[PDB]
Amino acid sequence: SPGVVISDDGYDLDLFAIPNHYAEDLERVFIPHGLIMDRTERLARDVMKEMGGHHIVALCVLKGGYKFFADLLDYIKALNRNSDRSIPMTVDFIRLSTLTGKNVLIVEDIIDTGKTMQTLLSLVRQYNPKMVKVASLLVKRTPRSVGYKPDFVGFEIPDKFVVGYALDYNEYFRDLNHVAVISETGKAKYKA
Amino acid sequence: PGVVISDDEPGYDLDLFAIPNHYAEDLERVFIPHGLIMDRTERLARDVMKEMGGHHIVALCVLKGGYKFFADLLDYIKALNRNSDRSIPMTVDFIRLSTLTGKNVLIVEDIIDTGKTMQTLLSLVRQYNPKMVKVASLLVKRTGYKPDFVGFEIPDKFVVGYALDYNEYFRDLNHVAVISETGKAKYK
Amino acid sequence: PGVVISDDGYDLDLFAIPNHYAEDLERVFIPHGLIMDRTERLARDVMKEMGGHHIVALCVLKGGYKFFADLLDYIKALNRNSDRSIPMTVDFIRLKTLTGKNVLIVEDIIDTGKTMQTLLSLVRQYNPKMVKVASLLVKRTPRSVGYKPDFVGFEIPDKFVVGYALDYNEYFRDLNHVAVISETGKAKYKA
Amino acid sequence: SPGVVISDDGYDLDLFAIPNHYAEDLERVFIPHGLIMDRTERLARDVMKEMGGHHIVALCVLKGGYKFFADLLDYIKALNRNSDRSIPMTVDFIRLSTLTGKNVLIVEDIIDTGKTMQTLLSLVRQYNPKMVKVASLLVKRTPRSVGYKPDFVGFEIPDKFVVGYALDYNEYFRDLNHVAVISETGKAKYK
Numbered sequence A: 001s002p003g004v005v006i007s008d009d010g011y012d013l014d015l016f017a018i019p020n021h022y023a024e025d026l027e028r029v030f031i032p033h034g035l036i037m038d039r040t041e042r043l044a045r046d047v048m049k050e051m052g053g054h055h056i057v058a059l060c061v062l063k064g065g066y067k068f069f070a071d072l073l074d075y076i077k078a079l080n081r082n083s084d085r086s087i088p089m090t091v092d093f094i095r096l097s098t099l100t101g102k103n104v105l106i107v108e109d110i111i112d113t114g115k116t117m118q119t120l121l122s123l124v125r126q127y128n129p130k131m132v133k134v135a136s137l138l139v140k141r142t143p144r145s146v147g148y149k150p151d152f153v154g155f156e157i158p159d160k161f162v163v164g165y166a167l168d169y170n171e172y173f174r175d176l177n178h179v180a181v182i183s184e185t186g187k188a189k190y191k192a
Numbered sequence B: 001p002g003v004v005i006s007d008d009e010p011g012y013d014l015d016l017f018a019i020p021n022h023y024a025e026d027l028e029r030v031f032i033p034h035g036l037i038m039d040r041t042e043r044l045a046r047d048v049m050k051e052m053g054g055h056h057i058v059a060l061c062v063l064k065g066g067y068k069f070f071a072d073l074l075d076y077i078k079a080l081n082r083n084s085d086r087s088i089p090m091t092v093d094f095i096r097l098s099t100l101t102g103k104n105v106l107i108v109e110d111i112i113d114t115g116k117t118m119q120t121l122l123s124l125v126r127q128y129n130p131k132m133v134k135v136a137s138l139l140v141k142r143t144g145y146k147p148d149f150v151g152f153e154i155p156d157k158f159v160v161g162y163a164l165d166y167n168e169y170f171r172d173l174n175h176v177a178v179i180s181e182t183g184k185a186k187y188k
Numbered sequence C: 001p002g003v004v005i006s007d008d009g010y011d012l013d014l015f016a017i018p019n020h021y022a023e024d025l026e027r028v029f030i031p032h033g034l035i036m037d038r039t040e041r042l043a044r045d046v047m048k049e050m051g052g053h054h055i056v057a058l059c060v061l062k063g064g065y066k067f068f069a070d071l072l073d074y075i076k077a078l079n080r081n082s083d084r085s086i087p088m089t090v091d092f093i094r095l096k097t098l099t100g101k102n103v104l105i106v107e108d109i110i111d112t113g114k115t116m117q118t119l120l121s122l123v124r125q126y127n128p129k130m131v132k133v134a135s136l137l138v139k140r141t142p143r144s145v146g147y148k149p150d151f152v153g154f155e156i157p158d159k160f161v162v163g164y165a166l167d168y169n170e171y172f173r174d175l176n177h178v179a180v181i182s183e184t185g186k187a188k189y190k191a
Numbered sequence D: 001s002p003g004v005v006i007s008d009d010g011y012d013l014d015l016f017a018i019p020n021h022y023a024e025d026l027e028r029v030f031i032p033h034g035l036i037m038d039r040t041e042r043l044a045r046d047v048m049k050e051m052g053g054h055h056i057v058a059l060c061v062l063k064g065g066y067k068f069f070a071d072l073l074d075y076i077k078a079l080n081r082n083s084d085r086s087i088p089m090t091v092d093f094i095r096l097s098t099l100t101g102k103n104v105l106i107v108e109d110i111i112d113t114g115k116t117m118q119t120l121l122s123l124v125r126q127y128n129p130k131m132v133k134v135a136s137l138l139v140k141r142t143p144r145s146v147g148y149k150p151d152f153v154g155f156e157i158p159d160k161f162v163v164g165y166a167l168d169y170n171e172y173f174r175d176l177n178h179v180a181v182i183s184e185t186g187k188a189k190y191k
């Protein structure tokens, strides 16, 4: 499954709640915060359906997108809360030999080209894990794609630079809970 | 007109969201996920404080149904009043009325179909001489009355989930989804 | 008797409180989150004792709608994971079809117990199958007639509380915590 | 302020929502999940008042306590969301240079002996940040303490081994949302 597909055919900024200091820094809102949560909940169910059998090593990729790792884990925890079974789980943050013979879940916020995840997978596999599966919230339909496709995808978004929820721009838009396309005004205002 | 959901867009495939297993064959598509509703409802609260709130607000919920939306909408409204340095008094009430005279009356509805409910309701409310009468409807069914505040404009399909029910079923369904012919015959 | 708050709450400066309500409160008895956690368990106690026959949830007016909405949400949450289509009736009543029904009366606060005793007397003449009362708050008061609800959220001291579901002359609705009103705020918002 | 003080002098398990597979693994619930959130919300406000405004560096200490770090930041980001000002913020993790000239906030889940923090504070202060302040969800009231006190304290708990929310035990109890006292059955089952 390609996940929730958003074609090239989001929302107007006036239809949702937006921080006033970001009003001119955004073009449109692609994915409202609540829509992310609902999809993330289903993602957690998909993961726990196949991977959630026993002990899980959930790896968060750093840096950028910790909010998605936190929310995904909460939904996963909520499922364990009603499983009639005490299930242990390892939670760590990649940027070692603990992964050997484990069910590893790599969690990423966004995959653009796919170079990051391809490098990361070719390194985790250098050890001896039972299996490595990757769950990503966002996946760009970009011509810059190397070809990689995650095992779990939340949203498939157009090839536009997005901010909000878990994605920041020079450590801005962290208080922005919606996934939104940055504008040239915001891109320039928050330049490093 | 609010968040428009056109006829040509299919909505959301049931495979993409969390749905009660007992409602699996009873739904066709998910139009509006629960989180989408809350986000839109949050903005609607801001729109209410924009045009209203200059005077004492009387929040009117209409029975039956839509109490869930009335509850959520007021929560966002009360949240806006929390960040104010002024203690805002607000009156809540439920109808099928002397309290309305000289007040800003907000009639909260979950869905508008034929529009006959609101037309009959408006006329009676403005008889009691309010300072302002406005209507907040979560859903407007594309089936000559237009609300002041609209959450979503949905196609002509019988929807259930979130505040909306069918023979008191689908109350546990948090998403606004289109009912199927199976579910229609099932819970008739 | 549910969570017991003895005569022996919290300081206002330890929680998130509306600045305009600073002088109007003495103490915070029950933070909003603590209400939610207890309400969640209450909903399970209801399903374990009333989830046998179709439930007619009756909300008592005025006040207590917020507790009614939250209680139902946790109830509906249990129905989602039941793998069964469970129909539920919701309705409202005031200071005044139920025959052979499993009726759940939802109240926010029981003080003297006169309201519920009167209500229960009225409902039982329609001859329902079962009547049970779930109250969020129950006061330890000498003015109590002796009535005890089937489901209790919190047993609180004999103090006039506001917040969450309880208002005072249409004030304190934005207050999410159950808190004791002060003489300052009570005289400030008097009608 | 010493934070919300829980005396040695908690809540019964039968009053709150608790997973069935942890039933015999717990003695008593000290802090329900919702109570934590209400307190964490106030802490975030204290933080933003005192060290907020401009740029801060949020450091989470590994391992454990990521949950409290996530929730505290959510409340912080909620504050910045309604501030009418674009506030930048660094989020980072560290396990025992960018910090220099910045407002460093160390976020801990629990402080017991205080050996972890005094060591951590000494290292961070070497890089001459503009200031270093520490927010701990739980401060364990114990004579084993070195005498260190955080700038921000959520709860001052008795000297009992607690699990839940952000405190795990051999990677168990991660699904437990309430801070509860572990039993001997659970301390041996998850050995």
Ligand SMILES: Nc1nc2c(ncn2C[C@@H](CO)OCCP(=O)(O)O)c(=O)[nH]1
Binding pocket: A063, A064, A109, A110, A111, A112, A113, A114, A115, A116, A117, A160, A161, A162, A163, A167, A168, A169
């Ligand atoms: N804020 C923001 N950052 C982005 C975006 N696209 C790429 N990046 C850069 C980083 C952010 O984590 O991701 C690259 C993943 P890779 O191309 O597969 O190696 C974007 O739309 N928004």
Ligand SMILES: Nc1nc2c(ncn2C[C@@H](CO)OCCP(=O)(O)O)c(=O)[nH]1
Binding pocket: B064, B065, B110, B111, B112, B113, B114, B115, B116, B117, B118, B141, B157, B158, B159, B160, B164, B165, B166
């Ligand atoms: N569950 C469900 N109920 C509906 C729907 N359309 C109409 N109704 C009937 C009721 C529901 O509250 O509303 C009527 C509004 P009116 O025709 O303008 O007076 C629908 O799509 N779903």
Ligand SMILES: Nc1nc2c(ncn2C[C@@H](CO)OCCP(=O)(O)O)c(=O)[nH]1
Binding pocket: C063, C109, C110, C111, C112, C113, C114, C115, C116, C159, C160, C161, C162, C166, C167, C168
């Ligand atoms: N806001 C507020 N109102 C209260 C309180 N105690 C009593 N009341 C009045 C009403 C309910 O609002 O109590 C009637 C229940 P009964 O005495 O058992 O018949 C209180 O602490 N706060």
Ligand SMILES: Nc1nc2c(ncn2C[C@@H](CO)OCCP(=O)(O)O)c(=O)[nH]1
Binding pocket: D064, D110, D111, D112, D113, D114, D115, D116, D117, D140, D160, D161, D162, D163, D167, D168, D169
């Ligand atoms: N699950 C649990 N773990 C604890 C507890 N007390 C200490 N620890 C261990 C670790 C944190 O997990 O404490 C280090 C802080 P320091 O002792 O001040 O240097 C406790 O009550 N529960």
Ligand SMILES: [Mg+2]
Binding pocket: A061, A062, A063, A064, A065, A108, A109, A110
């Ligand atoms: Mg990332």
Ligand SMILES: [Mg+2]
Binding pocket: B062, B064, B065, B066, B109, B110, B111
């Ligand atoms: Mg209606």
Ligand SMILES: [Mg+2]
Binding pocket: C060, C061, C062, C063, C064, C107, C108, C109
């Ligand atoms: Mg009442």
Ligand SMILES: [Mg+2]
Binding pocket: D061, D063, D064, D065, D108, D109, D110
């Ligand atoms: Mg720690």
